[PDB]
Design a binder for this molecule. Structure first.
Ligand SMILES: C[C@]12CCC(=O)C[C@@H]1CC[C@@H]1[C@@H]2CC[C@]2(C)[C@@H](O)CC[C@@H]12
Ligand SMILES: C[C@]12CCC(=O)C[C@@H]1CC[C@@H]1[C@@H]2CC[C@]2(C)[C@@H](O)CC[C@@H]12
Lengths: 277, 277
């Protein structure tokens, strides 16, 4: 009857706002499983759910740790309807800093949550979709998945990885009737200094500050409401033939095109260096 | 005096051929540390070294496991010259199959060797390069880093990740005088069926066969000599101002451009589906 949606990473941000947008939809078309790594963070989702007056039974929370394939399987068994019509792979971690200041565990964690975590969800959920010959997968992407950003080396690695993962899968899934799309987000309004200085050189440290200053100004001028981003997920959801990629904004497309039409990377690296520094 | 080169993944392929090309250079400009995960595989490198008559002391082998930051640090201490002029990040794993048939450990291993392994090398070696204000980093890339290939979902994820990692770093390293370049390789002439069938559906299994058939024909028609690929690394090495990206072939550039100029991904996914299936 209803469209069953399971969303990862609902404790804040896009995931939180998408979950309550869908559950509160005036048409009541959606049953939403909002999943979270730590149940102690669920308060914010329930406060938003109340604000939007989600009908009882339109929204349920599950604990799901995308690092643990047992946790993934336990949450899938909790989908009482026995299918997922829309899977939204949104859990993700950022990681910001000079590459040599990043702990090895932090690097592996970002990769595990952002890439392997999405692999675990797709392994768990794609089979029943392929069998039914139907289902929609939406994956939260980033501008940092489409072009490299300084001091985001590992975050960008992880978001570029989701691009390759999803594009590869889409080439195969086409004749199966299962549609996968990336939702490419720019900024969204959702170590300490001594720590970082201890792990890098003064010149890199200064470039980091410059990057942070520029980033803050891009964010204050350009950040989108998660309400507006969530509606782009909805657009993808309802598209009779969805495309592989949706963009939540036109903002970064000129930078992207400059990347796109000089494959040597020389124009992009130059332009981004000037843009930031 | 000599240009000190440390290359990862020298047991076969590009890494093996690049190592002996450099060590055997008639000019004797290069001292090469060819590194390998398992020393039992070093025979092939030494057979090639003899064939090309590398002078004694032009080539040394080190054991290096890019999964282990202690192994990385132990090999760096073995660079008797106390600097690395050229770091070649080439170790890599493939992974081929229906996504749901891939073991979780195999997925994590590919990511660890191909992405985190390269992060470990850059963390270990970039600091002294930035300090000197000089050094060249060359990273073995792939066509699968630039466009998604069906049944290579995790391999492509890993090779897309190297793109984001390197591009992000290049934006920063520009004013430091340290130059990083990807060398984008097409095919290079360097589970059992019951296993895979047990882990997927018959229809995906059949698409896998089709992909393998097409792949084999692309390889037989298009595979390059690693001798020819190694010379593209040399070109990058010697370029007074290197670009971010070198391509070893023009072959896949029409497919890439079609990807590049439809950001929605719709033309690429369609064209690649038709190309393979
Ligand atoms: C990381 C930031 C800033 C913080 C964030 O939420 C993600 C966002 C993605 C767009 C980036 C931006 C930093 C400034 C950049 C790099 C602009 O120059 C162009 C794209 C911007
Ligand atoms: C994985 C393969 C085949 C095996 C290999 O060594 C890597 C190589 C990269 C180019 C791929 C190719 C498979 C066939 C493809 C997908 C062609 O259609 C275009 C690019 C090709």
């Amino acid at each position: 009857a209803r469209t069953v949606v399971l969303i990862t990473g609902c404790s804040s941000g896009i995931g939180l706002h998408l979950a309550v947008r869908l559950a509160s939809d005036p048409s009541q078309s959606f049953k939403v499983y909002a999943t979270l790594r730590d149940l102690k963070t669920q308060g914010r989702l329930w406060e938003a759910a109340r604000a939007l007056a989600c009908p009882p039974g339109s929204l349920e929370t599950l604990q799901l740790d995308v690092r643990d394939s047992k946790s993934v399987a336990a949450a899938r068994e909790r989908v009482t309807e026995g299918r997922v019509d829309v899977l939204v792979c949104n859990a993700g971690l950022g990681l910001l800093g000079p590459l040599e200041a990043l702990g090895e565990d932090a690097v592996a964690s970002v990769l595990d949550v952002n890439v392997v975590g999405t692999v675990r969800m797709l392994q768990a959920f794609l089979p029943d979709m392929k069998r039914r010959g139907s289902g929609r997968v939406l994956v939260t992407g980033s501008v940092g998945g489409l072009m490299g950003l300084p001091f985001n080396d590992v975050y960008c690695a992880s978001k570029f990885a989701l691009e390759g993962l999803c594009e590869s899968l889409a080439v195969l899934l086409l004749p199966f009737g299962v549609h996968l799309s990336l939702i490419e987000c720019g900024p969204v309004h959702t170590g300490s200094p001594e720590e970082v200085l201890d792990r890098t050189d003064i010149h890199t440290f200064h470039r980091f500050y410059q990057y942070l200053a520029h980033s803050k100004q891009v964010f204050r001028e350009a950040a989108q409401n998660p309400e507006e981003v969530a509606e782009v997920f909805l657009t993808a959801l309802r598209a009779p033939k969805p495309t592989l990629r949706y963009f939540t904004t036109e903002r970064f497309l000129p930078l992207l095109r400059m990347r796109l039409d000089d494959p040597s990377g020389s124009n992009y690296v130059t332009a981004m260096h000037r843009e930031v520094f």
